[PDB]
């Protein structure tokens, strides 16, 4: 359930690759008009700049936002990043989605809905 989200994303990508999905229907028509990618499941001890530098390998990040708690210390695992171009978001969802770093691997998805602070899930 919690870790099966990355499995579902990888399975969707594999099915699009195996079902002969074209470029126009390659799991991007729904995430269009917005490059706000939501990363979740990250560890509680992750820093903002470290994650920015890690996700910056696929391009320049425009506006990142980590889940800042009221008094916990900004340790929730959720994060929303509107990158420079939507092509960078697609590249991150294709390569960085499900990447393993700092022990527990995290998941990535394309929201393209709004700037919701409380929208992810533990």
């Amino acid at each position: 359930n919690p870790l099966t989200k990355v499995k579902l994303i990888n399975e969707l990508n594999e099915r699009e690759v195996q079902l002969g999905v074209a470029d126009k229907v390659s799991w991007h028509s729904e995430y269009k008009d917005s490059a706000w990618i939501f990363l979740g499941g990250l560890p509680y001890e992750l820093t903002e700049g470290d994650i920015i530098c890690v996700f910056s390998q696929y391009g320049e990040i425009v506006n990142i936002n980590l889940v800042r708690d009221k008094k916990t210390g900004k340790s929730k695992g959720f994060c929303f990043l509107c990158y420079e171009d939507q092509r960078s978001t697609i590249l991150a969802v294709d390569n960085f989605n499900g990447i393993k770093i700092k022990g527990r691997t995290i998941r990535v998805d394309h929201v393209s809905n709004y700037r919701a602070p409380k929208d992810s899930e533990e």
Binding site: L12, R15, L19, V21, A22, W27, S29, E30, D109, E122
Partner: protein, 932 residues
């Protein structure tokens, strides 16, 4: 990665509890010291001696090699960068097929060629597992038979000790695992009590077979676990599954849960009820309650409707779980309640009433996936409620559902889809309010090009769309879904087509408007024009759409005909296959709409394209021709039968599957319906060609061949067909060999059996055992197919059956018993008592026999005789055998008596003779002697 824990499985109540306590007190101080500040950890002499088995001795040869290897830690760093006959032994015994290198470690004991040395003798005799796993099919069957017979001899201990590691082979392929599972099942079918100590050892290897992707493999694992549980006691299985509750490995917890579910399915719900109740009331750890909730959920999902009576009791197990502090326990309890609900038909709403109030209360304080679980539970519980409370429940839940409509969580999406399918199906759902509130988001938020890609998501969306269309209306869903008809996505297009087809089939397309009808026609055209994956979605959709449109599809008829022609001229296997499929599907609509010129043009194009070499296209063309002959009349069909029959004659040797099936169907329909355009010599040639069609690897082909032979017999005549059938030399005894006898029976049922009887009696005079057995089987099948018609042929069939009753061969006796069974079933009430007695006179000695086929035939014939000859004569013939001294004779006679007593329970009163009254027993029914 999750399955990799299976690789970490080692083999082999108070001592286990202390071991688990030591495991916990070893798994605590590791992170303790980690915070205070592996598989390659230090090893001990005890650990070393325990790791490897016997047959080894530690021996550091000199006193210098030990202090040569002791500084090897430093010798890996400083001195490492520095200045610096024809023997072999495979494993043959007499054949002993090639053992893989991974299997070399397992079958190493057989590599030694020593012979003639008891325990080692049995261990070497247990090397047949190598031939079973690796070897030819005959060697596999022989090893299976030897293991079945040598169960008690080889002993269950060594068998399990040799089978468990093979199951744990990292290189164990799927076929090897299947063979090992079959061998374990065969071993468990014989050994009953000896499987108790190896319960845990077998379960540790069998549980992962349940948690697997292969559906057939999961079914085999569930069956094996159920058999293992039914073998030993529920108490022993419970003791074996006890420590797995608090196991650290969550995979071990899931395995134990599946095992407990299988044990409950086998030994029954209440047998495992109090163990589960004690597991649920465990305040030891939250993992215990989680394992209990998972076990309850799995047991419900496996049992289905079996939780009806114990459901209230299950509520007693689940009531204290809803108040769990840890969110995991609460989620597991919600999933369990949802499983018990959705698996249960409407009943026992009161049993769930205790869980009604808090869950909705949790909806008030719902946040995160807990809200999703609560929504799923409320959706499962809504139909179980009555309309009065259901109105308020649905009115409250719909707002939360609409609020959660924009959830990115795919689990939340599935929960919302299930809640919509459950709630929208309620009678208290507002149609206009539904179309106003839930319809536009369901089309926008729920319907997306990414959701359809998933497997479960596709079926969930299909069910939700079907329910919404049935609830609110068909026109709105049609208008929402027709726009996606031109979708570039093939999967989304298939989903939209399936939704439209289900809607048209359930609600009916009469509500489809003219503009909506044209849009649907354009969508179907675009879909048929773009079909990459070979699937019946587009074909079934076009068929249902045409059947629903009816006469309204006449304006769309010519466009469809032009598209079909262009696709027939297009790529054959890609385009013309679907073209012929659409033609065969819409033949009914084309004939209903009076497409006379269209039907003739289609027939001409079919006669033109019948010469295609592609079997996929040729078979579809033949099927379309069959459909046209079914819609267009024989004399009205423009491609007349005079050209169709001889042209389809040599097509029987196409050797393709679909081509052969379509050709057989077309020839059979033409010969059953018309039976006139086919000439006598033409019919003889068609029969000579169909005689070769019986060698196929299918059963439907054989049935169609028999039907076509019967039609040809009814058309031409009995003599030539019986002569062509009598030449069956039966090269092979299988591959539809008896099929000639079935065809003889079909011809006898279609034609005069007065002609078919003596020809068969004369053909039975041949010497060949194959021909004699064939004549017997054909006579049996003919009597069975005739039934009431056999009132005259009884006296004529008596002597041949009496002569063949002489057991010269087992197959002859089997055919005799089968013919007797068919005759007794067919001669019911016709007055054939004399022939029945004459046949029983020779059938009675057949009771003593060991052949499974012969024994089954004798039992069936005894049943038929009791049906027709009557139970009085049956008991009179089986009376002396009841109290016989022997074991085998008493067993056979008791089987016969049980068969005679299963039925005729009322008529056994009179047949019971008068046995004299002993001293301490008065068995004589004096009331029967009451002379009025």
């Amino acid at each position: 990665e999750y399955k990799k824990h299976r690789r970490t499985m080692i083999i082999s109540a108070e001592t286990p509890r202390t071991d688990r306590g030591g495991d916990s007190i070893g798994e605590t101080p590791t992170p303790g010291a980690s915070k205070r500040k592996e598989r390659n950890r230090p090893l001990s002499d005890e650990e070393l001696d325990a790791m490897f088995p016997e047959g080894y001795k530690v021996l550091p040869p000199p006193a210098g090699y030990v202090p040569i290897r002791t500084p090897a830690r430093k010798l890996t760093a400083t001195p490492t960068p520095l200045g610096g006959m024809k023997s072999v032994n495979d494993q043959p015994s007499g054949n002993l097929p090639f053992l893989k290198p991974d299997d070399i470690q397992y079958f190493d004991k057989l590599l030694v060629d020593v012979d003639e040395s008891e325990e080692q003798k049995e261990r070497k005799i247990m090397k047949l597992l190598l031939k079973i796993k690796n070897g030819t099919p005959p060697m596999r069957k022989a090893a299976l038979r030897q293991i079945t017979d040598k169960a008690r001899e080889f002993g269950a201990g060594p068998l399990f000790n040799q089978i468990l590691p093979l199951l744990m082979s990292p290189t164990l392929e799927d076929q090897e695992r299947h063979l090992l599972v079959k061998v374990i099942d065969r071993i468990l079918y014989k050994l009953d009590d000896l499987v108790r100590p190896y319960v845990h050892k077998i379960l540790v290897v069998i549980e992962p077979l349940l948690i697997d992707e292969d559906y057939y493999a999961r079914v085999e694992g569930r069956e094996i676990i159920s058999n293992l549980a039914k073998a030993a006691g529920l108490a022993t299985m419970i003791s074996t599954m006890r420590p797995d509750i608090d196991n650290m490995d969550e995979y071990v917890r899931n395995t134990t849960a599946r095992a407990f579910a299988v044990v409950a399915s086998a030994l029954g719900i209440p047998s495992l009820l109090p163990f589960l109740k004690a597991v649920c009331k465990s305040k030891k750890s939250w993992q215990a309650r989680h394992t209990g909730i998972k076990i309850v959920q799995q047991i419900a999902i496996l049992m289905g409707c079996a939780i009806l009576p114990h459901l209230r009791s299950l509520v007693e197990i689940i009531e204290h779980g809803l108040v769990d502090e840890q969110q995991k326990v609460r989620t597991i309890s919600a999933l369990a309640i949802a499983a018990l609900a959705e698996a249960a038909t409407p009943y026992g709403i009161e049993s769930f009433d205790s869980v009604l109030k808090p869950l909705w209360k949790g909806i008030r304080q719902h946040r995160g996936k807990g809200l999703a679980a609560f929504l799923k539970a409320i959706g499962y519980l809504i139909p179980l409620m009555d309309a009065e409370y259901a109105n308020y429940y649905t009115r409250e839940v719909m707002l939360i559902l609409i609020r959660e409509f924009q959830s990115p969580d795919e689990e939340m999406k599935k929960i919302v889809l299930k809640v919509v399918k459950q709630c929208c199906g309620t009678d208290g759902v507002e149609a206009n309010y539904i179309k106003t509130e839930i319809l536009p988001p369901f089309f926008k938020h729920f319907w997306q090009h990414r959701m359809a890609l998933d497997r479960r998501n596709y079926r969930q969306l299909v069910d939700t769309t079907v329910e919404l269309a049935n609830k609110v209306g068909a026109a709105e869903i049609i208008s929402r879904i027709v726009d996606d008809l031109k979708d570039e996505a093939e999967q989304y297009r298939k989903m939209v087509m399936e939704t439209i087809e289900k809607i048209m089939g359930n609600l009916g397309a009469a509500d489809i408007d003219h503009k909506l009808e044209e849009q649907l026609i354009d969508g179907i055209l675009y879909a048929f024009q773009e079909q990459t994956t070979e699937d019946s979605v587009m074909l079934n959709g076009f068929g249902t759409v045409v059947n629903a449109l009816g006469k309204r599809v006449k304006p769309y008829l010519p466009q469809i005909c032009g598209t079909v022609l262009w696709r027939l001229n297009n790529k054959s296997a890609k385009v013309r296959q679907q073209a012929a499929d659409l033609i065969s599907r819409t033949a009914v609509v084309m004939k209903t709409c009076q497409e006379e010129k269209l039907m003739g043009h289609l027939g001409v194009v079919l006669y033109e394209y019948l010469g295609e070499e592609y079997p996929e296209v040729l078979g579809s063309i033949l099927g379309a021709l069959k459909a046209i002959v079914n819609v267009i009349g024989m004399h009205k069909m423009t491609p007349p039968i005079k050209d169709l029959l001889p042209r389809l004659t040599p097509i029987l040797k196409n050797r393709h599957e679909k081509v052969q099936e379509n050709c057989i169907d077309l020839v059979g329909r033409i010969a059953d319906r018309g039976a006139e355009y086919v000439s006598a010599r033409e019919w003889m040639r068609i029969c000579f060609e169909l005689l070769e069609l019986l060698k196929a690897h299918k059963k439907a082909i054989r049935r169609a061949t028999v039907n076509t032979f019967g039609y040809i017999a009814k058309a031409i005549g009995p003599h030539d067909v019986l002569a062509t059938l009598l030449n069956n030399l039966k090269v092979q005894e299988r591959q539809n060999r008896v099929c000639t006898t079935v065809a003889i029976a079909i011809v006898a049922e279609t034609c005069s059996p007065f002609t078919v009887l003596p020809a068969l009696m004369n053909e039975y005079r041949v010497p060949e055992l194959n021909v004699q057995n064939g004549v017997l089987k054909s006579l049996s099948f003919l009597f069975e197919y005739i039934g009431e018609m056999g009132k005259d042929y009884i006296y004529a069939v008596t002597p041949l059956l009496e002569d063949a009753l002489m057991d010269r061969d087992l197959v002859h006796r089997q055919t005799a018993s089968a013919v007797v069974q068919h005759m007794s079933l067919g001669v019911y009430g016709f007055g054939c008592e004399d022939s029945l007695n004459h046949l029983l006179n020779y059938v009675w000695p057949n009771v003593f026999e060991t052949s499974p086929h012969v024994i089954q035939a004798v039992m069936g014939a005894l049943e038929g005789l009791r049906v027709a000859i009557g139970p009085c004569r049956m008991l009179q013939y089986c009376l002396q055998g009841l109290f016989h001294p022997a074991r085998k004779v008493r067993d056979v006679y008791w089987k016969i008596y049980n068969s005679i007593y299963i039925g005729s329970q009322d008529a056994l009163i009179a047949h019971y003779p008068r046995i004299y009254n002993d001293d301490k027993n008065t068995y004589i029914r004096y009331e029967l002697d009451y002379i009025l």
